Amino acid sequence: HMADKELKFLVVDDFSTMRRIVRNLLKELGFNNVEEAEDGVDALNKLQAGGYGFVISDWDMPNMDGLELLKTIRADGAMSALPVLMVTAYAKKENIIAAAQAGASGYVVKPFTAATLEEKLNKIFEKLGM
């Protein structure tokens, strides 16, 4: 998948407020193909629905937390290379390490600015040649 306007995003967070910030930011960046999920399980259900080219995910969520969601994606042969950008309030280095090692594409700490989100998505695009 390429970082054109068609790229389909899944935005995962247990708080709609954060999902809403991220969707609106993506729109501003020219990405309108965006769906939401409320937790890791819901997210896996949509991911299984097919078509997604990028995940942005919270960490602390009921049902399945985002570290589990990230690991699950990375271990699944059908989606193991799916970009996953963590966006979370967890700021300790051990958290950043656990997610990095689990294969996170990137990591943004809440609260974040619009410029930061844009910068970190662009870094992932460049890295993967999207």
**For 77-81, which contacts have Cβ atoms below 8 Å and span 24 or more sequence positions?**
79/47
As a whole number of angstroms, the distance between CA 8 and CA 80 comes to: 17
Q: Which does 90 bind (CB under 5 to 8 A by kind): Mn ion, ligand BEF, none?
A: ligand BEF
Q: Which does 57 bind (CB under 5 to 8 A by kind): ligand BEF, Mn ion, none?
A: none
As a whole number of angstroms, the distance between CA 89 and CA 82 comes to: 22
Would you say 108 or 121 has its CB closer to ligand BEF?
A: 108
Cite the beta strand spans of the chain per DSSP E.
9-12, 34-37, 54-57, 84-88, 106-109
* H helix or E strand, kind and range, residue 125: helix 114-128
CB 58 within 8 A of CB 87: yes
Q: Residue 89 interacts with ligand BEF (CB under 6 A)? A: yes
Q: Residue 58 interacts with ligand BEF (CB under 6 A)? A: yes
Report in angstroms how near the CB of residue 96 gets to ligand BEF at its nearest: 12
| Footprint of Mn ion (CB under 5 A) | 14, 58, 60
| Stretch near ligand BEF under the rule CB under 6 A, chosen from 4-12, 21-29, 30-38, 83-91 | 83-91
Binders of ligand BEF in range 90-119 (CB under 6 A): 90, 110
| Stretch near ligand BEF under the rule CB under 6 A, chosen from 38-46, 54-62, 73-81, 96-104 | 54-62
* Closest to 87 in 3D by CA, of 95, 75, 78: 95
Task: Give the interface with ligand BEF as residue ranges (CB under 6 A).
Answer: 58-60, 88-90, 110
